[PDB]
Symmetry: none
């Protein structure tokens, strides 16, 4: 007969966008 | 006799969140 | 004699880090 199923493959490899700009500073 | 184990499977498929809002700007 | 190779293994299991903080905001 054929052998049994092979091993599971390796795990998939995710990269790190910048956050939104901050708010304006306090009112003058 | 039974054949050998099959070959390893393929690698799994990782997605890239945006960071948090930046700091407030300087006082007006 | 020895049988055929077993079936290929299944696909492996990738994980999704958050980006850096955004840029400073504009002048107030």
């Amino acid at each position: 007969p054929p052998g049994p199923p092979g091993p599971p493959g390796p795990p998939g490899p995710g990269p790190r966008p910048p956050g939104p700009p901050g708010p304006p500073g306090p009112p003058g």
